Amino acid sequence: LLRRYLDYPVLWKILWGLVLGAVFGLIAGHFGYAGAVKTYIKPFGDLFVRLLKMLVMPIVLASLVVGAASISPARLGRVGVKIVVYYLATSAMAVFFGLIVGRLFNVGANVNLGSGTGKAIEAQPPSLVQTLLNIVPTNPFASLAKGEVLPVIFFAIILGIAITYLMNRNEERVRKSAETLLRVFDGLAEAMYLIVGGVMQYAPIGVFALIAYVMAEQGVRVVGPLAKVVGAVYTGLFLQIVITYFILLKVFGIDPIKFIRKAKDAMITAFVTRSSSGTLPVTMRVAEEEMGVDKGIFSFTLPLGATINMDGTALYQGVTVLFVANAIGHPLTLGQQLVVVLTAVLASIGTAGVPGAGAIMLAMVLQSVGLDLTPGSPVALAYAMILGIDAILDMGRTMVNVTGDLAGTVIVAKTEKELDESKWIS
Amino acid sequence: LLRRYLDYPVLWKILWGLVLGAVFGLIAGHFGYAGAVKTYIKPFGDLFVRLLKMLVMPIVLASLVVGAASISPARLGRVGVKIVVYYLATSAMAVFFGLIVGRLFNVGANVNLGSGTGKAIEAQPPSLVQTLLNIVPTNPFASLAKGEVLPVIFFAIILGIAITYLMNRNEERVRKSAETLLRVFDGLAEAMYLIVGGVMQYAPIGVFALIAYVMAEQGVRVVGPLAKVVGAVYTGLFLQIVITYFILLKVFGIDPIKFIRKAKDAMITAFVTRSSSGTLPVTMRVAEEEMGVDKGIFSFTLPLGATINMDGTALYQGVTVLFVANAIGHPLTLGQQLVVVLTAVLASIGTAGVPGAGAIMLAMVLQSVGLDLTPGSPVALAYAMILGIDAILDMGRTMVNVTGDLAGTVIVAKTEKELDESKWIS
Amino acid sequence: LLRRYLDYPVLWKILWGLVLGAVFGLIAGHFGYAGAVKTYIKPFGDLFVRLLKMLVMPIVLASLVVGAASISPARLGRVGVKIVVYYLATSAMAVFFGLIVGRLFNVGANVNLGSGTGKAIEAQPPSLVQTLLNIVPTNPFASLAKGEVLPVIFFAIILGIAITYLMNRNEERVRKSAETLLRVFDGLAEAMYLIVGGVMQYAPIGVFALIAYVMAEQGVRVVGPLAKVVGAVYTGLFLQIVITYFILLKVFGIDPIKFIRKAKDAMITAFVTRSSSGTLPVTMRVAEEEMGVDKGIFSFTLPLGATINMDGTALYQGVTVLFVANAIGHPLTLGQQLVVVLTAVLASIGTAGVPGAGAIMLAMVLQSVGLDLTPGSPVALAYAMILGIDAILDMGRTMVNVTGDLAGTVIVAKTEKELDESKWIS
Ligand SMILES: N[C@@H](CC(=O)O)C(=O)O
Ligand SMILES: N[C@@H](CC(=O)O)C(=O)O
């Protein structure tokens, strides 16, 4: 197994590791070894989750610069508008679908938390203008060294536009200086893609361990409200993939049933790794090999959509907010519905392509809309039972995130006439 | 539409923006729209301030490394000693002007502000040696993140000197590596200059918004002895321009009237944007096109003196601390005034080149007169009105700061015989 | 005269610094002047510690990147991986011998300059696995900012390996971008080596000031424990040679006495010239003649060996970290005695060629093990002494470095059957 392992195709490796981890977790729960797997196996899962975070800031700083500097600034404006309007519209529709399914399945209806009416009057703090300001970084190095991906995306796009303006300057000193800066960033982006492709070789172990621990420990609590919220979130993600992307691809002229069988390379790799930004190379190659989108369009829309376009995270937050609110004996309202429609999206735009950041930004959206939790509050008792099925729904959440990443680049490229129609026919 | 506005020559549209903002603020104070302006108009000003602060660490680090690495070791040492003794001399003389002006105006006396002086009487020096040690960055990346300007200036200078020493090695691998590092930093500085060009093209709207909000809210509040502060600060500035610069220019030979005629471009573009590191391009342009100064002088002095040389911040700090100390009813003795001078100089250096930074650094000199910034105390009740007038105070501050940086560059140039004397002839 | 100051050997200069520091401190403490040396003198020796901490993080990141880019599974053949595994293994065992002998001699036991029993008593030590998977950084820029050494050594090694894997790609843009990124990091490492040269030139004054303040405020017996640290390091080096190689050499089937009775020509000149890189010519000469190793592999094992295989420096760090940890008061624990091993080995993988590499690679280990070097704490006072006797430890640790390189060459030659066994008869 010295190289039979490392040579095996990484997709089938992860897809095998997932099922082995599932069966092994169920068996370790059976034989009663929950603590055993929590002590001896989970450290490798945590190592994987920590490996998938050194590949978020370098790969979003050095890939946006190279993507935005490799486009004419006018085409960059046009493509960026066409793709950001799509990201926002689809995240909005995702939250809408999440709220619909959360109302339909009646998520968390019989939780029996003993909390009749905790708190709902603080539903509307969602500072909008302050966030649209916070996109701009008061200090770019602070936004890098603190973990905020949206300010560093803004600064990286600005730097890319500046470099592509420099590379057309009369002097030769500034021309070569800007070319060298762009080459530094190109080298960094490529080195990060290579490190990600190397971490993926360890992924068939660090996802084995993660799902082994999840199955072992929380394989029994998915019976009532938890099974209902899992069913709700996954039916919502299915509804999204079947309605939103399919309508958007049919109204433009892209066979959805073909787009899916083309994206099945990245859908899976994001489904099991649970990191829409650690599966970025597979997306940036499945959007160029199969779908044929030009290197100009995807190389900027995908490194941006990998972090700011999270339809699945929007949907998961929209469903779990309704869950935790029905868990405190007082559902949302119409006003609270639209408050979520905005706050969940303004949180999706922020959360990074990290395994299990949806839970953190979910706690954030709760601390926004009324349900403020203290370390002993009933809202906290309700939200704490979500981090159990965290992974079991994070998988589908990330799958929909990446599928949406792909069906936006395809739309933009089909509009811009940069879609190789020779690839879209059999 | 836009391209018409985008070509209207800036520095002649930003002034129109500022005057429209003054008119709008007065009209809003008339109709009592302070809240409407603060909620609709101010966010553009906040965005402009954040865009200005975004370009303070990268532009300083990059332009300073390039400047220090492009001159010489020895010529850099000489220019550095001359320009540092110049900045210290002018800051000291400016604080002396500030103190004598605050005394001559009887500022903050008839205000009969609270006399709660029971804990803020014991004055203490600023621990000078501790600051001179703080100049050395304990961790250069931590000093880039936390947004400290003097440690990053020190690291940039030492790195530039080291790169110049490297570029002379007999080897070739290390010479080419040094050239590549320096070209990275050159490209970064040039990209930051383009970004500042774009921000300053946006600056009409931002200036309109900021000064409109101010002249709406504080358009009626500056009637009483608070106008004494404006008179004092503006008199100190107007005379330090015509007593310190108009003498230091006649001792060395530069005709000061021609100096003003030539520096107008960088004067009325920093009087309205209130940022020294946001007029660094509109200063490095004038000190190369109209002043006629060698590139290897103003390419280091101006990025250096952008932050450490703040004569108007020093004068403003002196006058304002005198105002507060008179507001609580505690005068300053002649001996204590020297402590105030030294702390105002020390707070001029380590102040950011951003709008409204001296007011934030006003506490650093308020501590050295023994005063304390505890809430509810009269000290805060005067600091509030100071923060109110901060807008116009900072406009004047930055204008005289940039004029001082220009005059210091010109002095170092003429004493180095690099000042191209063919531009100073009628 | 300052040229004579810069011309005296940097290491033998710090020893006179330490000796005059001890003498001047004893005098000023016996004649009632402790305040004088603490207020006037001491800030020199504090600026020195600030200058040492300024250089750790850049010389860790930028040097590890180039180092790991010279040691890569993508440019290491069969002979390469053998010698690199041997180098890392023997450096690990050398740090372990250093820690063992430091525990045996009980170095720095009676220094007593520790403040008390504990400032953050028991420090809540994380589990061993929680500090084994705390090597991978969740954010590489945050680990640069917060000044963590292992989460940036790991990221730098990963980036370097990826960069080597790039420069062998069939493309041209990617290969060129990787070459440019490596040029950037090479230039940064060289600039840091220049700054380290300058700081170590300043180090006599800094060490003199630090030790003078120490001896003035409290008698700490600088002569006793240091006379024990030198003895402990030399016993560790003798043990390192005897055990670590005489075991390995006899395991791989080579007479150890027949190896030592030949390498004596290189050990002596490595002892005297104290520059392993400068001793490389005669090292290759002896490995050619006496060891009978063919040119094909000591043309590669010795050059690489004299720059990444620092067994003597590894043992020096292993012992002086124990000395510092036992001096400032709280002994060193397993969860830390393994971090010391990891950081010592993974920095030897990128050892700088400069007089003063042990000093930096010890400030780094004291920063990574959790004994932060800092301006004033007993860590700086117990680290200045080791920086003092650096010039006594160097003459032996260089001998151990060169003998380790020779033993590695002979071992790798035996495991591949290229021994001129006609040189090993009687
Ligand atoms: N980890 C997901 C986001 C989430 O699940 O919150 C992603 O990579 O986009
Ligand atoms: N506005 C000043 C800063 C300050 O006044 O604090 C400047 O020129 O940067």
Author numbering:
A (entry chain B), B (entry chain C), C (entry chain A): 5 to 430
Wording from the paper:
Using a sub-saturating aspartate concentration, in which we aimed to occupy ~1/3rd of the aspartate binding sites in the nanodisc preparation, we were able to solve two distinct structures, with different asymmetric arrangements of the transporter domains. The individual protomers in the two structures are either in the inward-open state, identical to the state observed in the Na+-only condition, or in the outward-intermediate state, identical to the ones observed under aspartate-saturated conditions. The difference between the two structures is the number of protomers in each state, with either two inward and one intermediate-outward (2 in:1 out), or one inward and two intermediate-outward (1 in:2 out) oriented protomers. Roughly equal amounts of particles were used for the two reconstructions. The frequency of particles found with “2 in:1 out” or “1 in:2 out” arrangement (89% of all particles) indicates that the inward-open and holo outward-intermediate states had the highest probabilities of occurrence under the substrate-unsaturated conditions. Our data indicate that we visualized a part of the multinomial distribution of the transport domains over all different possible states.
